[PDB]
């Protein structure tokens, strides 16, 4: 039966998919030929193909907008129609749209080109990478770190402020014109589900859930913060108050997004040897071939398919040398038409082993939803791909797997102290980033909502810094600065809450798959290898793509319609008890009023 509108939309979607497959394949092939062999011919071909693809997409969008959505009763065609009908930027007038593109490119350029020069030696000038990152990573000098921090900020943020002001105003005009409340509501729209009874999800439910879960995360972070504060007091005597917040420029990176680089300064038991299996790999004369063969064997051992011969034939797995310069950022390419490759300049290190496992998890995700229609070939939401890669890397990092594969000696004794070392190193990275992410996105949401006037942007930014993250600026900043925009994601128009959601999802998935694998010991020692049941349970979710709602896909694996924090707390329980014992005679919490200046 059905209406006459539906059938027309069905025929249109068939024609659109069949026309778009080839254009997307050509554009992706062109971008691959560029990224592995940087020449001018290749960049010109890349830009030509990209402009052709964008023109085709805009033509098909303007055509598809003529089918009235309300009369469609088939959910798949409804999703594809909604995806195609997104106006995007087109609802803006021409002159302001040109100005918006101009300001976007200007911010990106000024970020990617800014240099700060040392006043002591005005001939020496450094950009952010690699100079400022190396200094902020390895320097132990308080004054030098403070100089780097203040020079970078007082240089780039002062320039960035007005561009960001106009960016905010234009983006809010655009978002309101496309029938949204603001640009933050637009961003939160990614999680909306509307139409399936019992699985719906509004855009404010996301805020509610994020706040409810950070409330439960708070105590573990408080204890970790107290421990790190004590260790830093031991590291910089007479500079840190035993009751105050941590100075922002002593956290291990340019912003404090990760406390990873404090492990050398905070290791609980430095007497034990570290489980670095790099030397064993090097002494057995392993190469990239062997590494990827082992990753493939791992993925096949749980019931997932092999890689295609095309992958092994077309991928570039080693540095082509000095004659041919390429981009070495590890990437997983879905070229279309069943062509899958990986571009990564692998070194013979344990980190590259783990990242090979991660990227091959990405590739397996991409392979699993290949039979879906074009516009449905994507993760359930923005957090699923990274969660899958991360659970792969977690399973691969367990010492049991390293022993069973033969790179670690069979007589390696697993004391209770190596486990605490491992859990602390994991916590510095995984839980240290959650308050930062939550606070950054809260500030962005509030700015877009118009709750923070322009004349107190930095005031509210540093108030939130103090209250939530427990971090205080080393020198006072007036409203001329724009310190939030000194981060890449802020100045390049990328959403940020995806990392919070993925951090929760990855431990939900780990709990589900280890319960399925009949694991009995502590969760952090779980290795899902040789569990075809877990493989099947994961594939049942992988195969859906974006055809079904993300709530149903998450329930299919974990049994819950919403994000949960108890998996993370169960992962960190031993470290939690160890900190609770270790902090018996320490102050837990912080006063929001002490400052490194007066």
């Amino acid at each position, epitope marked *: *039966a*059905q*209406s*006459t509108i539906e*059938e*027309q939309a069905k*025929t*249109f979607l*068939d*024609k659109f998919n069949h026309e778009a497959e080839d254009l997307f394949y050509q554009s992706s092939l062109a971008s691959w030929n560029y990224n592995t062999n940087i020449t001018e011919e290749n960049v010109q071909n890349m830009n030509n193909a990209g402009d052709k693809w964008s023109a085709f997409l805009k033509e098909q969008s303007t055509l598809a907008q*003529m089918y009235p959505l309300q*009369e469609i009763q088939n959910l798949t065609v409804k999703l594809q129609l909604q995806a195609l009908q997104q106006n995007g930027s087109s609802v803006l007038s021409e002159d302001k749209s040109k100005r918006l593109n101009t300001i976007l490119n200007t911010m990106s350029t000024i970020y990617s080109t800014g240099k700060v020069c040392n006043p002591d030696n005005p001939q020496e000038c450094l950009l952010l990478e690699p100079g400022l990152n190396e200094i902020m990573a390895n320097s132990l000098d308080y004054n030098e770190r403070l100089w780097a921090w203040e020079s970078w900020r007082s240089e780039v943020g002062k320039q960035l402020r007005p561009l960001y002001e106009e960016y905010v105003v234009l983006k809010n005009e655009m978002a309101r014109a496309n029938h949204y409340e603001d640009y933050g509501d637009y961003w939160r729209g990614d999680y909306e589900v509307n139409g399936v009874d019992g699985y719906d999800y509004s855009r404010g439910q996301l805020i509610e859930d994020v706040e409810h879960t950070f409330e439960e995360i708070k105590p573990l972070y408080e204890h970790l913060h107290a421990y790190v504060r004590a260790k830093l007091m031991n590291a910089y005597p007479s500079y840190i108050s035993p009751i105050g917040c941590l100075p922002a420029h002593l956290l291990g990176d340019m912003w404090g997004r990760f406390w990873t680089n404090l492990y050398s300064l905070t290791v609980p038991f430095g007497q034990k040897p570290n489980i670095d299996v790099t030397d064993a790999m090097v002494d057995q004369a392993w190469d990239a071939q062997r590494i990827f063969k082992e990753a493939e064997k791992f993925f096949v051992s749980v019931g997932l398919p092999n890689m295609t011969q095309g992958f092994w034939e077309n991928s570039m797995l080693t540095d082509p040398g000095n004659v041919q310069k390429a981009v070495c950022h590890p990437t997983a390419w879905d070229l279309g038409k069943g062509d899958f490759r990986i571009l990564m300049c692998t070194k013979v290190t344990m980190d590259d082993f783990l990242t090979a496992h991660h990227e091959m998890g990405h590739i397996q995700y991409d392979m699993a939803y290949a039979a879906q229609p074009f516009l449905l070939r994507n993760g359930a939401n923005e957090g699923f791909h990274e969660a899958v890669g991360e659970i792969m890397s977690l399973s691969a990092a367990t010492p049991k797997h390293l022993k069973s594969i033969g790179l670690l000696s069979p007589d390696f004794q697993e004391d209770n102290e190596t486990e605490i070392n491992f859990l602390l190193k994991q916590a510095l990275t995984i839980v240290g980033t959650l308050p930062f992410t939550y606070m950054l996105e809260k500030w962005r949401w509030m700015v877009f909502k118009g709750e923070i006037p322009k004349d107190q942007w930095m005031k509210k930014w540093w108030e939130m810094k103090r209250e939530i993250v427990g971090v205080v600026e080393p020198v006072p900043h007036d409203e001329t600065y724009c310190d939030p925009a000194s981060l890449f994601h802020v100045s390049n128009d990328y959403s940020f809450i995806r990392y919070y959601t993925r951090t929760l999802y990855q431990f939900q998935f780990q709990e589900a798959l280890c319960q399925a694998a009949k694991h009995e010991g502590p969760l952090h020692k779980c290795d899902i290898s040789n569990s075809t049941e877990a493989g099947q349970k994961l594939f049942n979710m992988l195969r859906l793509g974006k055809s079904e709602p993300w709530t149903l896909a998450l329930e299919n694996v974990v049994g819950a319609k919403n994000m949960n924090v108890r998996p993370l707390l169960n992962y960190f329980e031993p470290l939690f008890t160890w900190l609770k014992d270790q902090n018996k005679n320490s102050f837990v919490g912080w006063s929001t009023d002490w400052s490194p200046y007066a």
Partner: antibody
Amino acid sequence: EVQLLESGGGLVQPGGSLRLSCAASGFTFSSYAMSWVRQAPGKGLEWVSGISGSGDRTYYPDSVKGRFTISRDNSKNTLYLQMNSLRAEDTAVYYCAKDWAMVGADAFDIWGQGTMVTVSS
Amino acid sequence: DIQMTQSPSAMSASVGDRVTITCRASQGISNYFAWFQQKPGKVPKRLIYAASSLQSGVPSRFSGSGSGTEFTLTISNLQPEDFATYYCLQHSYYPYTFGQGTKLEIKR
């Protein structure tokens, strides 16, 4: 110009079979849905059957469901209607009409002359 | 199944009279509507195709109106060659259904 033509009308026994053909010319046959419309003698009209563009989804009405089968060969620009288990009530003139395209709300506009299908013992 | 009840069934009028034929749908059928004329022994010829859009080559005395659930065909001034049978047809939802027809006769 579009000049739909029909053939295949004759006399058949009750319970017999018959295959109607409708030859299309003058337009891009492969991009238009086609339909069959009959007229009982001295009565109104009814929608016998309908097909989609790429000869895939075929729709039917409760009266002649499961007895009739519509089909097309886009190569020969020919539309077919296969009718089995005919009964005395199927006596009617049958037309083949053009139908919707892919975007507009246009509908039946070019019809053939018809062919007379009498079912009697 | 949308069920179409046409009123009236028959109708007689003189040349010049204003004639109005109605076709009612039991539910909403959007703007997918069409009116067909049939002379005896000839093929139905389309007059209006989007409930209100006149067909090329059809005199302007024919006009169509209405939407939603109620629809009306109207002839502004009758003509000798206007004596025929008129059918309404909806093609929105499957299956499709015609009206019972309306025969417009001469008054003597």
